[PDB]
Amino acid sequence: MRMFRITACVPSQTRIRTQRELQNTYFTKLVPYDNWFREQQRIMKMGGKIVKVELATGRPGTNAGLA
Amino acid sequence: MQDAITAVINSADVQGKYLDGAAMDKLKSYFASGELRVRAASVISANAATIVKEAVAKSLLYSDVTRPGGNMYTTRRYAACIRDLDYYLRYATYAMLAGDASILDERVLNGLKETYNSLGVPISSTVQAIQAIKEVTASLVGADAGKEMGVYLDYICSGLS
Amino acid sequence: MQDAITAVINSADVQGKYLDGAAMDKLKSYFASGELRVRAASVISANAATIVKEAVAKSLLYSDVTRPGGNMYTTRRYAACIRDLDYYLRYATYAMLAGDASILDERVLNGLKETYNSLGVPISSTVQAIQAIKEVTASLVGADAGKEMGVYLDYICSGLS
Amino acid sequence: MQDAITAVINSADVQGKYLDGAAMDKLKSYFASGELRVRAASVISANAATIVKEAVAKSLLYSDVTRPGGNMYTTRRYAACIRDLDYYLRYATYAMLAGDASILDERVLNGLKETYNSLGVPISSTVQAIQAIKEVTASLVGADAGKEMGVYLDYICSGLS
Amino acid sequence: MQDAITAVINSADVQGKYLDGAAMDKLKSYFASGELRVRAASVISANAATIVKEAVAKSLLYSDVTRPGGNMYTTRRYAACIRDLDYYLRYATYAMLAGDASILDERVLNGLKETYNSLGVPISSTVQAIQAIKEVTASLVGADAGKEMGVYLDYICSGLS
Amino acid sequence: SIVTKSIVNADAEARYLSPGELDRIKAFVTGGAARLRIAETLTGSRETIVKQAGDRLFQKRPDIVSPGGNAYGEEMTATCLRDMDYYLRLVTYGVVSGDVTPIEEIGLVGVREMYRSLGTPIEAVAQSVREMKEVASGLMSSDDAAEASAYFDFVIGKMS
Amino acid sequence: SIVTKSIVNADAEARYLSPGELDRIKAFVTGGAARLRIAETLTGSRETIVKQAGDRLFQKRPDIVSPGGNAYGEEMTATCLRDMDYYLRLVTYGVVSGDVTPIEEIGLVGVREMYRSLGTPIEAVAQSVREMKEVASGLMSSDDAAEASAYFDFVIGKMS
Amino acid sequence: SIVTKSIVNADAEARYLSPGELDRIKAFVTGGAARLRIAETLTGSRETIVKQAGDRLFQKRPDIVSPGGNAYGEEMTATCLRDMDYYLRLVTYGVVSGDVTPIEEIGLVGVREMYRSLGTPIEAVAQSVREMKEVASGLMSSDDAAEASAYFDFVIGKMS
Amino acid sequence: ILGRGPSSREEVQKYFSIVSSGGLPALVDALVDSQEYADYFGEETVPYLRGLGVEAQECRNWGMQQDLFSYSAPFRKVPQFITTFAQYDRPLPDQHVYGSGNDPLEIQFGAIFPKETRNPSKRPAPFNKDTKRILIHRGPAVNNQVGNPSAVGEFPGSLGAKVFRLNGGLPGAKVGKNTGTSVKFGESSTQALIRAAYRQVFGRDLYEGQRLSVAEIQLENGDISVREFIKRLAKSELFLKLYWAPHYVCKAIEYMHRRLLGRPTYGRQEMNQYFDIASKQGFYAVVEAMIDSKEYSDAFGEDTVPYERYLTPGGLQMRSARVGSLREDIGQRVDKEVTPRFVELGQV
Amino acid sequence: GLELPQSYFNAAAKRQKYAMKPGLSALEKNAVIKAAYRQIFERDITKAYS
C-alpha cells in the first residue's frame, strides 16, 4: 500500500517530563495512507507543527493497484 | 502493487475506455508466460535457503568482507546481510510472479540506496552477491526462466547500485 | 555508544587481534583516571541543581529572554530550560565517566539543533548558558577533572552551534 | 413440543387466515407419509437393540475410546453410552413421526452440548456413533425410511457439532 | 473452527492413523456437496441485506417489539437488532460453506445466551426472527441449500434456546 | 488482481507463495482465455445490456423517472446510464483481473456516502446492477454467465 | 483448509466471501479427486517412502547414525522413522485439505523449539523430508507429483 | 563495559549515577589489575586451551567430525578451531571489559540464524565452550576460575 | 423431592441450615415431612416436575428453575439459586456487562474464558448503557483516571507493571558513528523493547518463524513508531489466528482491549463502539481504532509499549488473595505483640 | 401464593401421575417404580445400569 513519509515536531504543554523526550518530540515516520488522516489529526489536535510530508511509496493518480 | 493485469486496467482507466486489442495482446502474453512464472517460483521456493547458502559460500565467504575489518565480520552484520539477500530473492520472486518490478520500486527501492550509503554497505559486494544469486537461480530453474528472473534481478541491482 | 574500554575493544576488533601492549597501557591509563572521574561525577551528582542555578544566575537572569517577549517568559518554558540544563549536565557527567563523547553524539545531538530551530530556542543564549555551566563546574571540581569537563561541555557547544 | 400439524396451525393462526394453499399440501404430504413412518417406528422399536449393537460394533468398538484412557473404558460409561444411543434412536423416532425437530430442540439439544462438555464425552466419536446408527437404520428399514430417520439423526449430529 | 475436511483430519490425527476408506467417503461426499454450497454462498452474499429486510418485515415490524416499550423501539435498538441478524446470516453462510457448525460454537454461541440475558433481549423474538430468516433464505436459495441453511439456523436457535 | 492479492498476502505474512494460491494462479492463468472471451463479449455487447437494464429499472421503479426523483429529465437519466456504463466497465475489469480489487479501488469504497450525498437510492443502484446481470446472463452463454454473475452479484451485494 | 482460511479472512474483513475465493473453493472442490488419488497412493505405499528415504538419509548423512549423533541407536533410528511417518501423514493431510494450515498447526509451529530441546538437526530433518518428496515423485505420475511436491516444499521452507 | 551499562541504566531511569554503582565502578577499578592479569594469562596460553578443548569436544561428540557432518575434513576442523579461538578472544574481551554485553553484541546476537544457515550444531558449539570452561578452570586458580566461569556460563546460556 | 426449585432466600437459608446441622438424612426428612410435600404428593403419589404448565409459576426463580428442570442440572456445580437470591438484594457485581463468561482470567498470557457449556456458571446481570465498571489501578491509588484524569500518563513506579520506552537511542540513528563501531552499546535496549512489545501483544514469547522481522527492522531503523509496531503486531495474522478467530466476538474485543490498553472496558459504551466497528468494518478496524483512541495516546506516547494499568477486583483477588503474597493486615485484626511486662521486669 | 386460570392447565402437556395403590398389577407397579426412579435420579438407573 502507498505510504506517507512524514516529519513533525510535537511539544509538551501539560507536564515537564523528566525523561528523554526528543525521539517522540521530533521524528520522521512512515504512516499508512488509510491511517494518515487520523494520525495527522491526532498530532495536529495535540498541537504539533509538521515540517515535511511526502509520498514515500506509490504514485499520485493511481486508479487501481495502489494496495 | 502494479502488475501486468493492473497495468492494463489502469492504462484503460486513465482514458476511461474499455480494453482494446492492444491491451489484450500483452495480457495474452502474460497469460502465456504465467505457467513458466509459476514453475520458476515453485523451484525458487523449493530451493530458497540452499541458493542463498551456496551463493554466500562461493561468493563472499572466507574473504575480506567477512574477515575482521570487513563490513560482514560481526555475526549481527552477517545475519543482516543474510536477511537482506533472502529479502532480495523473495521480492525478486514476487516481481517475477507479478510480471512487473513495481513491487521492487515500492517495497525494496524506497530509500535503500541512501540507507546503504549512510551505513557504508559495499555496493560492489552487493552487486557481486546479486549476480551470484542470479547465476545460481539461472542454473537451477532453467535458461529462459532464469533469464526472465535475471531481468528483475539486474533491474533491482541497477536500482540499488 | 562507546567508552574508552569499548573503543580499545573496537580498535582490537577492526584489526582482528588480541589486546597488545599499547591497548593495555590505554586501559591502565583509564583505570588511573577513573578515580578522579568517579569523584567528580559524585560531586556533580550531589550538586546538580546548584550548578544550574549559579549558571542561570550568571548567564540568563535579568535579560531580554526572561523579560516578556523572550523565550524564558512562560514558567513552563523556564522549567523546560532548567530541565534542558539538567539534561546537558547529566549527559556531560555520563561522557566524563565514560571518557568519550559518543553518548552526546548518539543521544542529545541527534536532532537538537534542528528542533531548537523549529521551536525558536536561542542557540547563542543556550551556548552562553552551557559556558556558564562549564565555568561553575570548573570552579566546583577544580581544574584537574575540570579540563575534561570543559572538553565535553565545549564539545556540546561545537555540536549545538 | 410441537409437530408439523401444530406448526401449520400456529402459522395459520399467526396469519389469522385459514389453511389456504400450501398448509393443505404439507398436511396431505404428512398424512400420506404417516402410515409408512408408523411402520418404520414399529420396525425400529422392535429391533432397537440391534441398531445400537451394530452401531457400536461398526464405529466405536476396538478403539481408543474403549481401551483404557478412553471415555468408554469402564462398564458404567459403556452402559451410559448405550443408553445415550438408545436415547438418540428413540428421540429420532419421535421427531420422525412428529415431522418436526422441536422435540429434539426441547428435550435433547437443550442441554446435550453442556452435559457433554462438562462430562468430557468426545463430540466426534458421538457423531460417528450417530452416523453408524443412521446407516444401520437405513440398511435395516430401507432407503426412504432411512433418509427420513437420517435427516433428524443428522440434525442431532449438527447439534453435537 | 473447522470444516468437514478439517474435522476428518483432526479425528484421524487424534486417532493417530492415516485416512481410511470411510474418511475418503466422507471427503468425497463433501466434494460432491461443494458446488451447491458455493452457489448458495454466492446467492446469499448477493441477497444479504434483502433477506434480513424481508425477514424482519415478515416477523417483527408492526408488532410489540417495534412498538414503544418493546426492545426494538429506539433507533439504536433497531440498528443493534439488524446488526445481530447480519451476524447470524453471515455466520450461517460461513457454517454452510464449511459444512460444520463449529464456527457457530466458537464465534457466536459461546456466550451469546448470557449476553442476551444480561441485555434483556427477548430470545423468543430472536428465534422468530431467525425462523423468518430461514423462510426468506429458503425462498431465494433453493431446496437442498435451504435445508442446509435451515439446519444451521436451527442450530443457532437451539443454542439460543 | 488475484496475483496482486496473493503477492500482498505473502508479503504481509513474510513468506513465499503458498501451494494453494500458486495452483490458483496457474488455473487462473489457464482460464484467462475464457475470461477474455467473456470480456470481449461484454465489450462488444455493452450498449444493449445497459439500455435494456435501464428500461427495465425505469419500468420497475418509476419514482426515479418521476418528478421529484433522483433522475428527472433526459440528461439526468443519461447520467444514470453513464453510471451504469461505469459499473459494467468495472465488472469487465473484475473479470479480466480475476479478483474484485479493481472494483474496490475504483467504484466500491465510499459509494454509500457518495450516493447519500447525491441523493441517489443505492438500493435502486443495486436493482440496476441486478437488471444488468440478468440481461447479460440472458444474452451470453450460461456457463460463462455464472462466472460473470459472480462478480456482478458481488457488486450487487456491496451496493446493498 | 482453504475453506477455513477463506472463512477466517472473510470474518477478518467482516464481509461475505469474495467471488475469487468462491472460485478457489469451487476449483478445489472440482479438483479434489486428484488430491484424493495422491493421498490414497501415499497411504497405500506409506512404508516404502519412509524406507527408501531413511536409507538415502543414512547414506547422505551418516553422521546422524554415527556415535555421538542425535539418532545413534536402534530405538533412535526407530524414532527417526517415526518422525518421517508423522511428516508423511501430515503431507497427506495437507494434500487432502488443499491448504497447508493443518501441516502448520500440527507439525510446523514450535518445531524449532521441539527439535532444539531434542538436540535434533533441523536441516537433516529437512533433508529427510526432501528425500521423501524425491521417493514420492519417483512413485507417482508427473503432474500429480508436481502438485503434491509443493506441500513438501512448504515443509522444507519452514524447517530449513 | 559495566561503566557503560551503569550509564545506560541511569539514563533509562533518568537519573545520575547512584552511589552504589559508583562504588561498583570503584571496585572495578581496584580489581582491574587481576581482571587484566586473567586476560593476559588467557592470551599467553590461548593456543593449548583451544587445541585440547577441541580434542575433548571431538571425542565427546565424534559425529561432527564424522563424514557427512558439518565439521568433517581438514578445512572444516581448521575453521571450527578458528571459531573456537574467536570465541576465546571474545571471552578475553569480556573478562577484561567486565561486562557480558560486548560479547553479546559482537559474537552472540544472530548466532542462531548464523549457524542455522551454516548447518553448525549449536549444541556442539555450546559443548566446545563448556570444555573451554573446564580447561580454563584447570589452568587457572579457583577464584579466577569462578570469576571467569560467570562469563563462560553466560556464553553457555546464550548458546542454549 | 418437591418437584420444584427453591423459592426464596429464606427458604434456601432454612434448608441450608438444616443440611448443615444434620446432613443429607436431615435435609431429606425435612423435605418429605413438609406441608408442601404432603399437600402435593400426599402419601402414595410419585413426585413430578411442576413445570410451566403444571401450576402457576412464580416470577422469582424462573431461569433457575428452568435450568434446574433440564437433565443437565447435575453438571452445573455452581449453586444457582442462592447466588441469584443474594444478588437480587445486593447491587450490581464486579462483572463484564455482557456476562460473567466474558471476563478473561487476569494472567500473563492466554485468553482463558469461562465456557457456557462446560461446567455452566453463567451469571447474567442487567447492565444498562452508561454503567462504568470500577477498576483497580496497578500503580498509585491516587493516579486512577476516574478521579485523576490528568494522571493517565503517570508511570507506576514500583507499584504497577514495568514501562518500556524508546528512551535509549536506536542504533544507526545518526552518522556520527561513521561505519565500523563494532561495540555500539545500544541495541540490546531496543531488542528488549521489541521483545516486550511482542510479549504485550501476545503475552508469551513467540517462536522463530512467527516474528515480523520487517516491522522489527523498520523500528530498529526508526521508520515506524512503537505505536505503529504495536498496531502491526496486533494486525498480524497470528493475532487473528490466536485470539480473534477461536473466540466469541465480544470476548475477543475484551481481550484485545486488555492487551492493547492494559485495561478492561468500562462498559457498554466502549463495548458497543468496538462491536459496531467489528460488524461494519472488521478486526483490523477494531485494532486501529483501539490504537488510535485518545486514551491510548494519553496513556502511551509514540514510543511507549503498552502495560497492564488496571485490574478487575476478581483478578486482583486471584493475584493477592492466595496464601503467599497476602499481607497480614488485609482482612485480619493485627494485635501488636509485645514482650510481656513480667518478662521485661525479669530482664536485668 | 399464586393463581392459574383453568384454561392454562387444559392444554399444557399434563404430567402423568403415578400412585401406588396396594392392589396394582405387575406392569403398572413396575411402571410406578420406574417413574419413581426417574423422579429421584432424573433417569432410569435400573434400566441403564441395573
Ligand SMILES: *[C@@H](C)[C@H]1/C(=C/c2[nH]c(/C=C3N=C(/C=C4\NC(=O)C(CC)=C4C)C(C)=C\3CCC(=O)O)c(CCC(=O)O)c2C)NC(=O)[C@@H]1C
Ligand atoms: C471371555 C471373557 C468371554 C468373551 C469375551 C468377549 N468380550 C468381547 C468384547 C468386549 N468386552 C469388553 C469389556 C470390558 N472392557 C473394559 O474396560 C471392562 C471393565 C474393566 C470390561 C468388562 C469390551 C469393551 C469389549 C469390546 C472390545 C473393545 O475393546 O472395543 C468380545 C467381542 C464381541 C464382539 O462382538 O466384538 C468377546 C468375544 N466372550 C465369551 O463368550 C466368553 C464368555
Ligand SMILES: *[C@@H](C)[C@H]1/C(=C/c2[nH]c(/C=C3N=C(/C=C4\NC(=O)C(CC)=C4C)C(C)=C\3CCC(=O)O)c(CCC(=O)O)c2C)NC(=O)[C@@H]1C
Ligand atoms: C456414546 C453415546 C458416547 C459416550 C456417552 C456417555 N454418556 C454418558 C452419560 C450421560 N449422558 C447424558 C445425556 C442425556 N440424558 C438425558 O436424559 C438425555 C436426553 C433424553 C441425554 C441426551 C447424561 C445426562 C449423562 C450423565 C448421567 C447419565 O448416565 O444419564 C457417559 C458417562 C459419563 C461418566 O463419566 O459417567 C458416557 C461415557 N461416551 C463416548 O465416548 C461415546 C462417544
Ligand SMILES: *[C@H](C)[C@H]1/C(=C/c2[nH]c(/C=C3N=C(/C=C4\NC(=O)C(CC)=C4C)C(C)=C\3CCC(=O)O)c(CCC(=O)O)c2C)NC(=O)[C@@H]1C
Ligand atoms: C549483504 C548483501 C551485504 C551487506 C548488508 C548489510 N545489511 C545490513 C543491515 C540492514 N539493511 C537494511 C535494509 C533493508 N530494509 C528492508 O526492509 C530491506 C528489504 C526491502 C532491506 C534491504 C536494514 C534495515 C538493516 C539494519 C540496519 C541496522 O544496522 O540496524 C548490515 C548491517 C549494518 C550494521 O551497521 O549493522 C549489513 C552489513 N553488507 C555487506 O558487507 C554484505 C556483503
Ligand SMILES: *[C@H](C)[C@H]1/C(=C/c2[nH]c(/C=C3N=C(/C=C4\NC(=O)C(CC)=C4C)C(C)=C\3CCC(=O)O)c(CCC(=O)O)c2C)NC(=O)[C@@H]1C
Ligand atoms: C534552556 C537551556 C534554553 C531554552 C529552553 C527551552 N527548552 C524547551 C523545550 C524542549 N527542550 C527539549 C530538549 C530535549 N529533550 C530531550 O529528550 C533531550 C535530551 C535528553 C533534550 C536536550 C525538547 C524536546 C523540548 C520540547 C518540549 C518538551 O519538553 O519535550 C523550550 C520550549 C518550551 C515550549 O515548547 O513552549 C524552551 C524555551 N530556551 C532558552 O532560551 C534557554 C537558553
Ligand SMILES: *[C@H](C)[C@H]1/C(=C/c2[nH]c(/C=C3N=C(/C=C4\NC(=O)C(CC)=C4C)C(C)=C\3CCC(=O)O)c(CCC(=O)O)c2C)NC(=O)[C@@H]1C
Ligand atoms: C415519513 C416521513 C417517511 C417514511 C417512513 C416510513 N417509515 C417506515 C417504517 C419504520 N420507521 C421506523 C422508525 C422509528 N421507530 C421508532 O420508534 C422511532 C423513534 C421514535 C423511529 C425513528 C420503524 C421502526 C419502522 C418499521 C415499522 C414498525 O414500527 O414496525 C415505513 C414503512 C416501510 C415498510 O417496509 O413497512 C415508512 C414508509 N418513508 C418515506 O419515504 C418518508 C420520507
Ligand SMILES: *[C@H](C)[C@H]1/C(=C/c2[nH]c(/C=C3N=C(/C=C4\NC(=O)C(CC)=C4C)C(C)=C\3CCC(=O)O)c(CCC(=O)O)c2C)NC(=O)[C@@H]1C
Ligand atoms: C434482534 C434479532 C432482536 C434483539 C437484538 C438486540 N441486541 C442488542 C444488543 C446486543 N446484542 C449483542 C450480541 C452479540 N455479541 C456478539 O459477539 C455477536 C456476534 C457473534 C452478537 C450478535 C451484544 C453484544 C449487544 C450489546 C450491544 C450494545 O451494547 O449496544 C440490542 C440492544 C439493546 C440495548 O442497546 O439496550 C438489541 C435490541 N432484541 C430484539 O428485540 C430484536 C427481536
Ligand SMILES: *[C@H](C)[C@H]1/C(=C/c2[nH]c(/C=C3N=C(/C=C4\NC(=O)C(CC)=C4C)C(C)=C\3CCC(=O)O)c(CCC(=O)O)c2C)NC(=O)[C@@H]1C
Ligand atoms: C566449531 C566449534 C563448529 C563448526 C565450525 C564452522 N565454522 C565455519 C565457518 C564460519 N563461522 C562463522 C561465524 C563467526 N563470525 C564471527 O565473526 C565469529 C566470531 C565472533 C564467528 C564464530 C563464519 C563467518 C564462518 C565462515 C568463515 C568466513 O570467514 O567466511 C564452518 C564452515 C561452514 C562451511 O559451509 O564451510 C564450520 C564447519 N562446525 C561444527 O560442527 C563445530 C561444532
Ligand SMILES: *[C@H](C)[C@H]1/C(=C/c2[nH]c(/C=C3N=C(/C=C4\NC(=O)C(CC)=C4C)C(C)=C\3CCC(=O)O)c(CCC(=O)O)c2C)NC(=O)[C@@H]1C
Ligand atoms: C397482560 C397485561 C399482558 C400479557 C400477559 C400474559 N402473561 C402470561 C403468562 C405469564 N405471566 C407470568 C407472570 C407472573 N408470575 C408471577 O408469579 C407474577 C407476580 C405474582 C407475575 C407477574 C408468568 C410466570 C406467566 C407464565 C405462566 C403463568 O401464566 O403463570 C401470558 C400467557 C403466555 C402463553 O400464551 O403461554 C400472557 C398472555 N400479554 C399481553 O399481551 C398483555 C400485554
Ligand SMILES: *[C@H](C)[C@H]1/C(=C/c2[nH]c(/C=C3N=C(/C=C4\NC(=O)C(CC)=C4C)C(C)=C\3CCC(=O)O)c(CCC(=O)O)c2C)NC(=O)[C@@H]1C
Ligand atoms: C507441560 C509441563 C504439560 C502441558 C502443557 C501445555 N501448556 C499449554 C498451553 C498453555 N499453558 C498456559 C499456562 C500459563 N499461563 C500463564 O499466565 C502462566 C504462567 C506465567 C502459565 C504457565 C496457557 C495460557 C496456555 C495456552 C497457550 C498460550 O501460550 O497462551 C499447552 C497447549 C494446549 C493448547 O491447546 O494449545 C500444553 C500442551 N501439557 C502436557 O501434557 C505437559 C505434561
Ligand SMILES: *[C@H](C)[C@H]1/C(=C/c2[nH]c(/C=C3N=C(/C=C4\NC(=O)C(CC)=C4C)C(C)=C\3CCC(=O)O)c(CCC(=O)O)c2C)NC(=O)[C@@H]1C
Ligand atoms: C476510606 C473511607 C476507607 C478506605 C479506602 C480505601 N480505598 C482504596 C482504594 C480504592 N477505592 C476504589 C473505589 C472506587 N473507584 C471508583 O471508580 C469508585 C466510584 C467512583 C469507587 C468508590 C478503588 C478502585 C480503589 C483501588 C485503587 C484505585 O484507585 O484503582 C484503598 C487502597 C487499598 C490498597 O491496598 O491500596 C483504601 C485503603 N479504607 C479504610 O480503612 C477507610 C475506612
